[PDB]
Amino acid sequence: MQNITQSWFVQGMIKATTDAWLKGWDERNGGNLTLRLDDADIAPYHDNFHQQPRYIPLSQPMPLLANTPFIVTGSGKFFRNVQLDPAANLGIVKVDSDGAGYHILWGLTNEAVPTSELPAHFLSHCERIKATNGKDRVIMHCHATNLIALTYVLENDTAVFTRQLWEGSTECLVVFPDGVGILPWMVPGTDEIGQATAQEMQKHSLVLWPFHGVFGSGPTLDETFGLIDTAEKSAQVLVKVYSMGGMKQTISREELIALGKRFGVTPLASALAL
Amino acid sequence: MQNITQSWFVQGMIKATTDAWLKGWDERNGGNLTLRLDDADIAPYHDNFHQQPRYIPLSQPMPLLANTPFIVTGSGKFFRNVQLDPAANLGIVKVDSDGAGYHILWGLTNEAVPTSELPAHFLSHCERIKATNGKDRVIMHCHATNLIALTYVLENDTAVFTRQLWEGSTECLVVFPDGVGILPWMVPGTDEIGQATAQEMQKHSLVLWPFHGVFGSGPTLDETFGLIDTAEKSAQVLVKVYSMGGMKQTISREELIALGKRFGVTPLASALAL
Amino acid sequence: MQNITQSWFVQGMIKATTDAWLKGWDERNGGNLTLRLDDADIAPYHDNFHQQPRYIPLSQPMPLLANTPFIVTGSGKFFRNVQLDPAANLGIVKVDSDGAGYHILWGLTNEAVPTSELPAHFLSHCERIKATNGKDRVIMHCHATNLIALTYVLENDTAVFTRQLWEGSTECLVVFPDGVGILPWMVPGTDEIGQATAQEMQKHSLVLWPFHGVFGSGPTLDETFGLIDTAEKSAQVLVKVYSMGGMKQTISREELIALGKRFGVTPLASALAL
Amino acid sequence: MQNITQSWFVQGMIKATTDAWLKGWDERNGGNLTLRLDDADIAPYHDNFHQQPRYIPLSQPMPLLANTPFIVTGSGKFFRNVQLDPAANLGIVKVDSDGAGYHILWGLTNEAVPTSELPAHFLSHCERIKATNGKDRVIMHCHATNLIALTYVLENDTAVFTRQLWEGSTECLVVFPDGVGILPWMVPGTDEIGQATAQEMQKHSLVLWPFHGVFGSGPTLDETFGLIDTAEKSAQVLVKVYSMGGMKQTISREELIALGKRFGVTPLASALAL
Amino acid sequence: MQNITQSWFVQGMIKATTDAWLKGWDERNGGNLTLRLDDADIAPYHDNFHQQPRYIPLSQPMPLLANTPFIVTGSGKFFRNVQLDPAANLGIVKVDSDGAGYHILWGLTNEAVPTSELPAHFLSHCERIKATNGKDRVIMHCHATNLIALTYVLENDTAVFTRQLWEGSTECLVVFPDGVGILPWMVPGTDEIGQATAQEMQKHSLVLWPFHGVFGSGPTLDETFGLIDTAEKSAQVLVKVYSMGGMKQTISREELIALGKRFGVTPLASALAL
Amino acid sequence: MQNITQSWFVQGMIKATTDAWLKGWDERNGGNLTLRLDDADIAPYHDNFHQQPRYIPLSQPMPLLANTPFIVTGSGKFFRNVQLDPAANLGIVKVDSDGAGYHILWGLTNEAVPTSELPAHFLSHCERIKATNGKDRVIMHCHATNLIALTYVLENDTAVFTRQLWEGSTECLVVFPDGVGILPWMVPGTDEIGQATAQEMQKHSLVLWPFHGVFGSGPTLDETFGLIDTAEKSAQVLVKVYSMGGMKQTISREELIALGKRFGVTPLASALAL
Amino acid sequence: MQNITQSWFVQGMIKATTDAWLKGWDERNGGNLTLRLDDADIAPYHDNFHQQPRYIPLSQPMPLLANTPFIVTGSGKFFRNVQLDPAANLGIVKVDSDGAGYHILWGLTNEAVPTSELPAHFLSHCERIKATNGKDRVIMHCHATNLIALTYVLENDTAVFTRQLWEGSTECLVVFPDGVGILPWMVPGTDEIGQATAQEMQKHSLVLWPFHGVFGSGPTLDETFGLIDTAEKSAQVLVKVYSMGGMKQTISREELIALGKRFGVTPLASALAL
Ligand SMILES: [Zn+2]
Ligand SMILES: [Zn+2]
Ligand SMILES: [Zn+2]
Ligand SMILES: [Zn+2]
Ligand SMILES: [Zn+2]
Ligand SMILES: [Zn+2]
Ligand SMILES: [Zn+2]
């Protein structure tokens, strides 16, 4: 049989983490990625299942995710190395029948464990499932450079940050009409930041962690990567503009509204009101 | 027979979209590319023609383009993926005998359609054919980073933008002596922005869409990519200069005139007058 | 999504047909391969399913195969080209709910059809399913050189051919204890040769077609390829031995029996009696 | 850290099994290879050591091999697949402190076990260590085609087989002056054939198994592969000669003696006496 | 035998220098890298040892490093070329029994010598061994762009530089809790700058050379590269922020303290006091 | 025979032009490169010499270059494409016996001609030969981004530009102690700019063309590329520092002097006096 | 500089030895190849010359070869490994000014020495130079399978062997009109067999060593390989024909004569007379 490393989901994880590494968004072990799978995706690959799946309890019960398999990045692992040794840096985990924990079916060799931002990932998957009737399947986190830089210079407010990002590239309204939610800075890797993130995920597909990075949700690896890339392109434009002295003209409220109408999208009200 | 994916035109499309992706000009589905072909180019490749070519009406009749085949990028498709799966992201279309619509001869698999900027593309091909006696064959659109940034900070005026870009790199006058036309911001993906672009294309080979990106036209994929790259290199230089406090010296009107004379080119008058 | 061409089953078909081409067993369009799949194998790959699956009736109803998907080689297609263009040379077909025909879900581009030995394949799958309680999943046919040559020189009889092949390599008894069935020469590509082959498949995993080639059955692509390779290695040895004047010593009946006992296998009685 | 698959010994195992596969010596799971290592060779690679090394008792105690690590091919595994998935087909085992068994430190995934010819391998390593003062480190077994064919046609006697192989290529006396030992046919995969092989290994570096294949020993993977290749090239020549009616002239006893003298080698007496 | 160029340590040196080249941190011969090895790492590779190891005296005796082998970059060699010709750009050196000098066992072909920053490297290895009980094995130096830029604009003081870098990316405190030491500018390539660097290395794992670059220490190539990458990512953020007019909000003292507590790290006191 | 495209000089031209393309220094046809060869370099490659070498007169006689072969980039050719089709983008030219013109021995297919900056190249080769006693062999021109940006913001004066570049990276004094000469802006592609450049080349190895790019000279492709890369790295640092408000501390005159003394280099006096 | 391993002559040696390995002509260390070079071929590559060239005396003085460089295969080295590690298996040697010995300028690492058939090689180069006015530059030896087999079955006589090889493929007369000389069997690796071979080389370009192999001479690596390949193809045909009972029809004397006339070649008289 073909090895699981050649599967669509390991190859896709390799693509997204390598692309994110080339972008300069994932120095060291910065970032983490988790993709929800089906039983069908992994069925062909039993030859690669560890004989004695390691069992690890979840920070807190998550019954909506019972029996759900996922492919995740490991704690302390480098995006840069996922293409070099997938099994060492990725893992396939399956949540048990009552949502209390998960088994490591494959990967995470040498006693590696899932990303320390697992709470944030699983709590958000769980909310994005409710918000999109199961259409979303990916949670991606990275240290998007210009988005981080802007958190030191713009008001850390959902409405003002959303409007600025919308202005920084025409497509932004269309790509993220629900805008981007901003949390206050929090200690990372906890249930609290996980919870706050999951909470923001009910209303937005993008969430910013000041002085830290971004979190995105989407139906596929490409759209989630694309979603973050759009927001970061916009941020990149803004960083150049602010470095040139600021906007002397920009996309206006009237134009944002025309844009939402032509693309059949309803823009986040707080950000449009500005 | 060799598969149409190995053809000169699919390979060329792969090169230009991949190069544009590496430049950071085409996040997500940003940008779109269309290349006019001949019957001879696709003659060898009938084995790859779909049995039942899907027929799609053109936004508006375009008789000057009757019976003309093109290779195009798909709507919502990522430049980053063209190299991975050409058929899923590109398509060969042929305009019918009376310019009313086109048939999808190849690609655009899974019910994909041509770029939503098709109007802008076809309308501009149509004008560039008239302006150049058929020499131009490509229309490329991308989210050129520095060019976008400059639309928030320079006067969105054809003459002032052209002069600034000419000053930002000696070769610019030579590469785009007709300068670059700027439109007002418009809702993208419409016949209106298409028309306005095509209109600008009668006088310029480069057209800017504020807060959005650029459009270029040329005889080949390489020259069109080159044309945009030149303009964006200039913009990149300008962004660094404005970030350093502004031009303390620059290419002068006298110099731009000497330059036009040595290269047998007649510089756009409004821009030279400044 | 990853393209179906990167799937385990297309990659496996590529491996087996390329390996068989390198062996010199598949000149021109010689040979054909068919692999039974599950719904799970193809579930991830709907993006690659033709919109209007072509429907083709089965030579004769086969209700035991209802709703079963398979990946097959095309009629007139070259094993050598499967690695170059999988979609042109392979196809994924699914038998309809009542076994009357099948839909072409993917591949077989340019109006190609499944192998003209489809009857032989499907009738044999059907018998091997009954004989092995669904463990067998592959039917492979190739023009194994030395096996063909021996059909002009040895008695075309199941018992004598089985015993000779068993003698030509120690492992043979262990690999094919049920021996190899020989048909009389028949016109290929018919229901009759299909039927005769399927009939032989109830008692053997290997069937020879004099002056033509071999047919093998097994749980996986590798074991079926390996099964044929073993039989052909043996044949290769025999062709050298007969070219040297014949066996001056060989594996005896007593030794074949000891061999069957150590490997817990019960050798075909007719061949052991010789 | 670099993955153990990139190590010198896994790469070497890949090379030798792949080369042997291309030679047509290893159909299916035919052949098996074992290479003795040092602690230093595997020291860098602890990250790849299974957490809970599976323990498997040796057929019989082998104290001379205590604490010795080896890389081996797996039982039922194909030489053809070693390059595709090293861990699935190879394994690193270490003999325990009192030679009673071994631990599987790496590989042999999916519950695979070492080759079923392990007895023959370990017993022979053990004798070749005594015969060469530890210089030999490899034991290779393969289904060398012409060598097999010749066992059906030449007298299965050490002296006559050795002399014929020495005559079949000038270098043979030089490469294997101790000649090649022939056993009677035996049931494979037992302690008995293991013992008999190991016994022959005290006097020869090559041992033939009639109707089966060859076993070779040497200091390195290359020399052992080379040793077998030499013997098989000779056999190939002999097969062509016997197919042409037999030797009409050949290397004479006098010549073989001159040859042994020029290369400072003392030819096996029984074979030279013929 | 496999060539030493395919070893774990040459491959790792290739990866780190190539990655640093792609980052734009090592123009020309900028940067130098040295990795401490064991006897076991190089034992397998004697076939590649020069016959007459060149002997070169150390700037000053270093008995703590006696008999220790290392792989180092050469003086005037380009990181960009390490992947193209490892032996021309790298070397394996072994310090003699009394720390007075070293032998060049491999590489540094065409009379090349170790990096001219060898003092700084060896003195620092020597101090990092004491400070970490031998856990550190790498010293890496590169011209990290943003880190260099910041030395012209921030107070060249350990405490203020450390606090600014900690603020520029949440993970920084966790990755380098001991902070980064800054030296006064010094003439490079001397014992004095080496000494000063080694001295800073007793308290920090990162050391900055104003108007020059950075030096890092760690247990492996990946962590040391990761360590520098983290510091440089933070600097990159700061350069964008200072280019936008400065921090309007940032990570506060209280937050840095909460962060150190959740990750069980004790932050450098001088930098936390600011 | 091996094709000239695999020669050291074509491969080296491919490397330098590809590297410069990845740096973003050579949009479109920006830049040009010329490398002096010997008769020995091209002797093995006569099979690839055009039968009827095209003859082209030199702008002005250059007897010091008589009978000297060179490999050059073509006029209007893209650095990006050199790796894709060397013969279409490069050419081997040999100056005739009296320096009046040259023959195109290889490449420049489809009627291409050497770079339109040929005057500047040949005139500079000619001066660098005199200034270095034939050690220099390369002249490289590129649109180095930050170096261009700085020409709009710093005083276009040899002394002040040299001192600023020296301050922007410690190594700069050591790499280019003769500093960088700046010309006034001139119409490119003429004998006049060629002459002025050649003139500046008597005293410097780096020459800047305001609002245009840089020209470098060196003994090999790697050192010339490295020389420009150093200068451009320094400019990149300066652009970040000026974007942050300017130098608050920098390398002082005293330190530059200590630096020149330790490296046995005599710094350009006008720049040190500032 | 590009490493000598990428040179035309190392690449050509890799090609020929790899091709010969794939042909099955060079088991173990069977065969050896030597190619005459010029000073110009190696001039670019001094960076790769060993500092202390090993000096080795020639078996006997050869003043006609004074100051001549050659690339040779090493003693005991495998053709299979030349592609994997050229320096370990090949060497560049230069004969000293008075033909007494040679220096090893490059390769033959780990104390390897030139092929033990060096006498045969150099003596033959020396004669082929005289016989062809320096046009021949290569001497190749290999264990061509069918040519070896035929030496046990055909009369070992120049005339009869030549005529049989001429009959076995129409082109043979044209490719080797001077026929192939056969020596009596001799102990290999001596001056005597070298001398005898060199002697045969005055009249033929192909020489056979019974029960051993062939030696060929030619102007280039490709023609020498081609020359042997032709002879071996013919032998391969003969071995099949003799295995089928012998020639029932063949190329007649009259036809050989017509053939020599149409190709302006004068066939060896002894072989035509048969
Ligand atoms: Zn993070
Ligand atoms: Zn757009
Ligand atoms: Zn058939
Ligand atoms: Zn066996
Ligand atoms: Zn440095
Ligand atoms: Zn230029
Ligand atoms: Zn030989």
From Swiss-Prot, chains A, B, C, D, E, F, G:
Q: How is the cofactor bound?
A: Binds 1 zinc ion per subunit.
Required cofactor names: Zn(2+)
Please, which domain of life does this record's source organism belong to? Bacteria
- Residues binding Zn(2+), per UniProt: H141, H143, H212
**The keyword Cytoplasm appears for this protein:** yes
Tell me what reaction this enzyme catalyses: L-rhamnulose 1-phosphate = (S)-lactaldehyde + dihydroxyacetone phosphate
**E.C. number(s) listed in UniProt:** 4.1.2.19
Cite the effect that the entry attributes to N29A.
Severe loss of enzymatic activity
The pathway where this protein functions is:
Carbohydrate degradation; L-rhamnose degradation; glycerone phosphate from L-rhamnose: step 3/3
GO term, biological process aspect, one? rhamnose catabolic process
Molecular functions per Gene Ontology: aldehyde-lyase activity; identical protein binding; metal ion binding; rhamnulose-1-phosphate aldolase activity
Q: Tell me which Pfam families the record gives.
A: Aldolase_II
Active-site residues per Swiss-Prot or TrEMBL entry:
E117
Cellular component GO terms held in the UniProt record = cytosol
In the UniProt annotation, what is the result of changing E117Q? Loss of enzymatic activity
The alphabetical list of record keywords is: Cytoplasm, Lyase, Metal-binding, Rhamnose metabolism, Zinc
Q: How does it assemble?
A: Homotetramer.
Q: What does this protein do?
A: Catalyzes the reversible cleavage of L-rhamnulose-1-phosphate to dihydroxyacetone phosphate (DHAP) and L-lactaldehyde. Also catalyzes the dephosphorylation of phospho-serine in vitro.
Entry similarity comment: Belongs to the aldolase class II family. RhaD subfamily.
Protein name, per record = Rhamnulose-1-phosphate aldolase
